[PDB]
Structure 1
Amino acid sequence: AEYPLPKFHFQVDWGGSRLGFTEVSGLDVETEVIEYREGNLPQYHKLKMPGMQKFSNITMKRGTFQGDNDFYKWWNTVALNTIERRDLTISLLNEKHEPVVVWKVNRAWPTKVQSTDLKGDGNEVAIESIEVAHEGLTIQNG
């Protein structure tokens, strides 16, 4: 309550079987600026007012396990213009595992899935990524 929070203890509800994600990025909101000036205004710069909103895609990365094929499962539910949409919840936890900051996403479906690359000299774990589109985002703190 008095200390600033760290950024390494979180969880994601995505209607998937397993949990334990490595990276989650892309949480933004924006509004466009509209500008205006008429000829007789004594200042020689413009006036500004709000416009339309814009939201970003969300990226998630996790490690690969035997028997788990969930990213592909969700991506592959796509017909011509129909797909299975889900509600997404992201929460940041503190030392006593209590949800402190919550991000609520609306109508999210997977737009991209990327698998790992194979290197004969690579001493690292295999990681996979998913990219998701949505129609809304909301922040709740305290």
Structure 2
Amino acid sequence: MAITADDIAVQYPIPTYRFIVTLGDEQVPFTSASGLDINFDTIEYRDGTGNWFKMPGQRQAPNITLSKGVFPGKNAMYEWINAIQLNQVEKKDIMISLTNEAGTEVLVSWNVSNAFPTSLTSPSFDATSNEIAVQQITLMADRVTIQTA
């Protein structure tokens, strides 16, 4: 029950657009950011007497997607996917925080520990479309946490 014993002000959920992403040691302006999920996969054990046992298992590896327009200048997402020799890749932290209207207060953030790139698409070079050239990068990491403040 809403048993606060007095009237409580209503809250609306904060919009998707006011967010902020830092790869790690720098802040990058992106357009989209998806797939920051905590996923477990269950383990079960059914029994002859009839008691089902349901449990969590391992926590699955996230597959984060980030997209951004193509700008004149240095491609910072290519200089990080270029520098791979056979297992060597420089892992990075990712934080995708979710600010207020002015942007001076972080409210909820999603923290990603060792994200390295696996792919980097080209834009759709379509001559028949007056549209921004975007490119997606897909990361793989090992854990996602949420901190609230």
Q: Same fold (TM over 0.5)?
A: yes
Q: Quick check: 20-29 or 31-40, which moved more? A: 31-40
What are the equivalent positions in structure 2 for 1:89-100 lying under 5 Å apart?
A: 89-97=95-103, 98-100=105-107
Deviation at 1:15, TM superposition (A): 4.0
Q: 1:39 maps to what in 2?
A: 48
What secondary structure sits across from 1:74 in the alignment? Answer: helix
Which amino acid in structure 2 is aligned with residue 120 of structure 1? A
Which structure shows the bigger proportion of residues in strand conformation?
1
Match of 1:118 in 2: 125
The 1-side partners of 2:125 and 2:147 are apart by 40
Q: Cα gap change, 1:106/1:18 in structure 2, threshold over 3 Å: closer, same or farther?
A: closer
Aligned to 2:57: 51
Which ranges of structure 1 fall in alignment gaps of 5 or more residues?
A: none
In 1, distance between residues paired with 2:12 and 2:48?
A: 52
- In the superposition, the TM-score normalised over structure 1's length comes to 0.88
Q: TM-score when scaled to structure 2? A: 0.85
Aligned residue pairs, count = 139
SS where residue 12 of structure 2 aligns? Answer: coil
Q: Choose the corresponding residue for 2:73, options 67, 92, 105.
A: 67
Cα distance between partner residues in 2 of 1:16 and 1:69: 16
**In structure 1, C-alpha distance between the alignment counterparts of 2:34 and 2:130, rounded to whole Å:** 25
